[PDB]
Design a protein around this ligand. Structure first.
Ligand code: HEM
Ligand SMILES: *[C@@H]1O[C@H](CO)[C@@H](O)[C@H](O)[C@H]1NC(C)=O
Ligand SMILES: *[C@@H]1O[C@H](CO)[C@@H](O)[C@H](O)[C@H]1NC(C)=O
Ligand SMILES: *[C@@H]1O[C@H](CO)[C@@H](O)[C@H](O)[C@H]1NC(C)=O
Ligand SMILES: *[C@@H]1O[C@H](CO)[C@@H](O)[C@H](O)[C@H]1NC(C)=O
Ligand SMILES: *[C@@H]1O[C@H](CO)[C@@H](O)[C@H](O)[C@H]1NC(C)=O
Ligand SMILES: C=Cc1ccccc1
Ligand SMILES: [Cl-]
Ligand SMILES: [Mg+2]
Length: 324
């Protein structure tokens, strides 16, 4: 079952004796998410980077005070498209045999590194998959985050910086990635993720939304909490995303096999249709990976789809691609 919210959601030391940072061992997996990477590298998750959905939800709440609804939606979305539904295991990075025997194609069970399922283009500190690596920390891109922080944040990363950098990354992908895709699920996640460093990597004793560059590097590059790091003082995820969107409002779309060909997609969800993003994710994305599942997979799909729906904002109607 999906874990419930924290019983005590106060700020507290999370870089503590029970959760020390350790370097990677051979075989340890890290991926495109600095939050999950940091939780693995402090032992909030298994240090090898393979975890159950329940482990992930507990870790993001306990270590960072990620809110329960957001934790549930993100975790089960990722698990449905990137995880093994029979073994209940998900890699936070590359595809691995450690998630167990694979389902039939076209399901990939590729981990969070799988491009175009959860992971996608115009990430802040990771390159687009077209350029050869969608998961490793990129120093040039991080230095650009530093530059934007210097220009728009007085040297700190905040929501103003996020609004400018988010747009810059989009414009850079339009100009250079002929396969750039920015629709549906990625269109939503790309905006919310830009708020996370301001909401969740800021020491919770301050919680002022101003992330210093030393802390930013520690999380983004080294998957490491600052010495004496306190988590946020209340549950949150994407609060202030409105600021990021308002800076440079965009329509969902894609380049069409050439640079500088960004073409709006009217069949995409956008922020005016959040229930459509959920419905397409289930009806198109999940269904295409598992078009005619065998009995044990159908059962696992339906269970995880029920859990996914628990993280969907009230107002939306549940959809049932495999029946009830
Ligand atoms: C709850 C489960 C979570 C899952 C399954 C997850 C997964 C992912 C994935 C696959 C990406 C890649 C998107 C991209 O292409 O850029 C991503 C990005 C990101 N995640 Fe998470 N994440 C979760 C929670 C969190 C939390 C709790 C934090 C912070 C405490 C966080 C911080 C970030 C950041 C900053 C990025 C953007 C990295 C960048 O653009 O350079 N995530 N996450
Ligand atoms: C919640 O945890 C904080 C910090 O660890 C502690 O000081 C506080 O008293 C706790 N609240 C309850 C109701 O136990
Ligand atoms: C190119 O875009 C398509 C979806 O539009 C996606 O399936 C494919 O994986 C992308 N490849 C790269 C390398 O970006
Ligand atoms: C990092 O990003 C830059 C800027 O897009 C790119 O040119 C470079 O090849 C990427 N990879 C590395 C390893 O620096
Ligand atoms: C970001 O920092 C700059 C410089 O301190 C400031 O002008 C701006 O109001 C900040 N934005 C937010 C959302 O805190
Ligand atoms: C998803 O499929 C259901 C049928 O199970 C249908 O009612 C709904 O309109 C579909 N939504 C989309 C966006 O395709
Ligand atoms: C940072 C991963 C994630 C989690 C929830 C929404 C968008 C992205
Ligand atoms: Cl919560
Ligand atoms: Mg990416």
């Amino acid at each position: 079952l999906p874990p419930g919210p924290l019983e005590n959601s106060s700020a507290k030391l999370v870089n503590d004796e029970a959760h020390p940072w350790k370097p990677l061992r051979p075989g340890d997996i890290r991926g495109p998410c600095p939050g999950l990477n940091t939780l693995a590298s402090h032992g909030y998750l298994p240090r090898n980077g393979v975890a159950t959905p329940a482990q992930i939800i507990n870790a993001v709440q306990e270590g960072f005070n990620f809110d329960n609804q957001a934790a549930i939606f993100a975790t089960y979305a990722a698990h449905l498209v990137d995880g093994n539904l029979i073994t209940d295991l998900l890699s936070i990075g590359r595809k691995t045999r450690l998630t167990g025997p694979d389902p039939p194609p076209p399901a990939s069970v590729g981990g969070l590194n799988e491009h175009g399922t959860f992971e996608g283009d115009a990430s802040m500190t990771r390159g687009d998959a077209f350029f050869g690596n969608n998961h490793d920390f990129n120093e040039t891109l991080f230095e650009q985050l530093v530059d934007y922080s210097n220009r728009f944040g007085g040297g700190k990363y905040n929501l103003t910086v996020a609004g400018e950098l988010r747009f810059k990354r989009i414009q850079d992908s339009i100009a250079t990635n002929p396969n750039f895709s920015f629709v549906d699920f990625r269109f939503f996640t790309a905006y919310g993720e830009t708020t996370f460093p301001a909401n969740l990597f800021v020491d919770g004793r301050r919680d002022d939304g101003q992330l210093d560059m030393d802390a930013a590097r520690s999380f983004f590059q080294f998957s490491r909490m600052p010495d004496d790091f306190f988590r946020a003082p209340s549950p949150r995820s994407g609060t202030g995303v409105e600021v990021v969107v308002q800076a440079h409002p965009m329509q969902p779309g894609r380049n069409v096999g050439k640079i500088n060909s960004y073409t709006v997609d009217p069949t995409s969800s956008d922020f005016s249709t959040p229930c459509l993003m959920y419905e397409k994710f289930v009806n198109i994305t999940v269904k295409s990976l598992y078009p005619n599942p065998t009995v044990q997979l159908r059962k696992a799909l339906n269970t995880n789809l029920d859990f996914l729906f628990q993280g969907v904002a009230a107002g939306c109607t549940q959809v049932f691609p495999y029946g009830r």
